[PDB]
């Protein structure tokens, strides 16, 4: 989360840098899953 | 996918001949784009939904 | 259990529900947000997990 | 030379492919230019057999 | 060096050969200058307020 | 090695202390003994299961556990593709590489010839099993590459494949 909470430092305080985001929401995603259910 | 990020796939030409004609009137589908189309249709179809999701009046 | 301690209701029965964010205003006293849970020293950190 | 359903040869000492599926009356070995065949291929003559082991009956209890 | 990781599926196994149909389905796209992707980096960040909730102040 | 039963009872022991067992961290353990099939023998297998994996090979399959000289094996299976092929299987790290056999059949010195043939029986071409049934095989081959005649050429698909699997040099 904090990894990508604080991002929007590096877009809105004005590329590769927006995968840091989309390629990491995929995580994101596979945060809060494998917290309840890792099948 | 599989709990994972449902994504979006694409339209043959048959599809975007009733988009060019509707005129006078692959990608990802993000975790934040289903949450303006959950909006509307729990709220403007609420009526359907009031009471089957409900086993009680 | 014992005899010299009453109780003076029961419980009927169940009710589901389905987690909004209206229901996160009351339900704790602090948030959690910081990653590790304790450091060194030995303390449990305030406002930690 | 010629085995079975198919032909082989004496300089290149190997077949060829099946002889329909490329030209008739225009084969050779695969790979040297050997050209053995004079198109007068073979008589194409296999007769197999079904040696009847798997047809379950009351009637090949008996033969047994 | 490393783009040889698609030169491990010619004569390979069966059923996890159908494995990798999910990432490659699942992976992305060209990630970088899609004509639209350079505009919508102000539509997801916008969306929050969250510039700066570090460890940093208080413990 | 060889000590005396008589000075074991000097090196604090058993009169006839059996040996064949580990002391690690205070107490005794044991390599146990262990079950497998047999060195260097052309075993049929017969199992659903060897069609359960690709687009239904077969029940049939011969196996060999074949052994190193310093006696850590692998695996040789085959398998019976029902089409009229018949396919190898492989083992490495945790990954089956199956293959076509007569690439790593005419691979290892030079029959191209009857030879290849000749090797089936020789002296019964009588029976019909046979020829309907290895030129299906040997076409499941000419369908691949038709100008692949020498073992040099036929080890050039290699190449392609087992540079990077094996972890090879770049100067080979
Ligand atoms: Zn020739």
């Given at each position: 989360?904090?990894?990508?909470?604080?991002?929007?430092?590096?877009?809105?305080?004005?590329?590769?840098?927006?995968?840091?985001?989309?390629?990491?929401?995929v995580?994101?995603?596979?945060?809060?899953?494998?917290?309840?259910?890792?099948? | 996918d599989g709990?994972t990020?449902?994504?979006?796939?694409?339209?043959?030409?048959?599809?975007?001949?009733?988009?060019?004609?509707?005129?006078?009137?692959?990608?990802?589908?993000?975790?934040?784009?289903?949450?303006?189309?959950?909006?509307?249709?729990?709220?403007?179809?609420?009526?359907?939904?009031?009471?089957?999701?409900?086993?009680?009046? | 259990?014992?005899?010299?301690?009453?109780?003076?209701?029961?419980?009927?029965?169940?009710?589901?529900?389905?987690?909004?964010?209206?229901?996160?205003?009351?339900?704790?006293?602090?948030?959690?947000?910081?990653?590790?849970?304790?450091?060194?020293?030995?303390?449990?950190?305030?406002?930690?997990? | 030379?010629?085995?079975?359903?198919?032909?082989?040869?004496?300089?290149?000492?190997?077949?060829?492919?099946?002889?329909?599926?490329?030209?008739?009356?225009?084969?050779?070995?695969?790979?040297?230019?050997?050209?053995?065949?004079?198109?007068?291929?073979?008589?194409?003559?296999?007769?197999?057999?079904?040696?009847?082991?798997?047809?379950?009956?009351?009637?090949?209890?008996?033969?047994? | 060096?490393?783009?040889?990781l698609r030169?491990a599926l010619?004569?390979?196994?069966?059923?996890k050969k159908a494995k990798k149909a999910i990432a490659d389905l699942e992976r992305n796209?060209?990630?970088?200058?899609?004509?639209?992707?350079?505009?919508?980096?102000?539509?997801?960040?916008?969306?929050?307020?969250?510039?700066?909730?570090?460890?940093?102040?208080?413990? | 090695?060889?000590?005396?039963?008589?000075?074991?009872?000097?090196?604090?022991?058993?009169?006839?202390?059996?040996?064949?067992?580990?002391?690690?961290?205070?107490?005794?353990?044991?390599?146990?003994?262990?079950?497998?099939?047999?060195?260097?023998?052309?075993?049929?297998?017969?199992?659903?299961?060897?069609?359960?994996?690709?687009?239904?090979?077969?029940?049939?399959?011969?196996?060999?556990?074949?052994?190193?000289?310093?006696?850590?094996?692998?695996?040789?299976?085959?398998?019976?593709?029902?089409?009229?092929?018949?396919?190898?299987?492989?083992?490495?790290?945790?990954?089956?590489?199956?293959?076509?056999?007569?690439?790593?059949?005419?691979?290892?010195?030079?029959?191209?010839?009857?030879?290849?043939?000749?090797?089936?029986?020789?002296?019964?071409?009588?029976?019909?099993?046979?020829?309907?049934?290895?030129?299906?095989?040997?076409?499941?081959?000419?369908?691949?590459?038709?100008?692949?005649?020498?073992?040099?050429?036929?080890?050039?698909?290699?190449?392609?494949?087992?540079?990077?699997?094996?972890?090879?040099?770049?100067?080979?």
């Amino acid at each position: 989360s904090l990894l990508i909470r604080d991002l929007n430092d590096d877009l809105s305080k004005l590329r590769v840098i927006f995968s840091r985001l989309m390629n990491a929401f995929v995580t994101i995603q596979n945060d809060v899953n494998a917290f309840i259910d890792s099948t | 996918d599989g709990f994972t990020k449902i994504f979006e796939t694409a339209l043959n030409e048959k599809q975007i001949t009733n988009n060019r004609v509707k005129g006078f009137i692959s990608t990802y589908i993000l975790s934040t784009e289903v949450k303006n189309i959950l909006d509307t249709v729990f709220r403007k179809e609420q009526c359907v939904l009031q009471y089957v999701f409900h086993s009680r009046p | 259990m014992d005899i010299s301690k009453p109780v003076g209701s029961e419980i009927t029965s169940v009710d589901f529900g389905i987690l909004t964010a209206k229901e996160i205003r009351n339900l704790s006293a602090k948030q959690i947000t910081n990653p590790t849970v304790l450091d060194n020293l030995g303390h449990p950190v305030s406002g930690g997990l | 030379s010629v085995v079975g359903s198919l032909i082989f040869c004496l300089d290149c000492g190997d077949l060829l492919e099946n002889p329909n599926a490329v030209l008739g009356s225009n084969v050779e070995c695969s790979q040297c230019k050997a050209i053995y065949p004079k198109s007068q291929f073979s008589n194409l003559k296999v007769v197999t057999t079904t040696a009847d082991d798997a047809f379950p009956s009351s009637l090949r209890a008996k033969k047994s | 060096r490393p783009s040889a990781l698609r030169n491990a599926l010619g004569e390979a196994f069966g059923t996890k050969k159908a494995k990798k149909a999910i990432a490659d389905l699942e992976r992305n796209r060209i990630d970088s200058d899609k004509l639209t992707d350079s505009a919508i980096d102000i539509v997801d960040s916008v969306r929050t307020a969250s510039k700066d909730l570090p460890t940093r102040a208080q413990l | 090695n060889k000590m005396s039963p008589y000075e074991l009872v000097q090196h604090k022991e058993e009169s006839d202390e059996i040996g064949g067992y580990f002391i690690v961290n205070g107490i005794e353990k044991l390599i146990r003994m262990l079950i497998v099939q047999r060195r260097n023998h052309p075993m049929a297998i017969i199992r659903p299961s060897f069609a359960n994996r690709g687009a239904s090979y077969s029940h049939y399959g011969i196996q060999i556990r074949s052994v190193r000289p310093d006696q850590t094996s692998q695996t040789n299976v085959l398998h019976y593709l029902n089409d009229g092929q018949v396919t190898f299987r492989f083992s490495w790290r945790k990954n089956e590489y199956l293959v076509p056999v007569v690439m790593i059949l005419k691979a290892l010195c030079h029959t191209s010839d009857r030879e290849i043939f000749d090797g089936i029986i020789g002296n019964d071409v009588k029976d019909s099993f046979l020829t309907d049934r290895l030129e299906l095989l040997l076409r499941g081959f000419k369908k691949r590459y038709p100008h692949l005649q020498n073992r040099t050429q036929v080890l050039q698909y290699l190449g392609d494949k087992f540079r990077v699997v094996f972890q090879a040099s770049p100067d080979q």
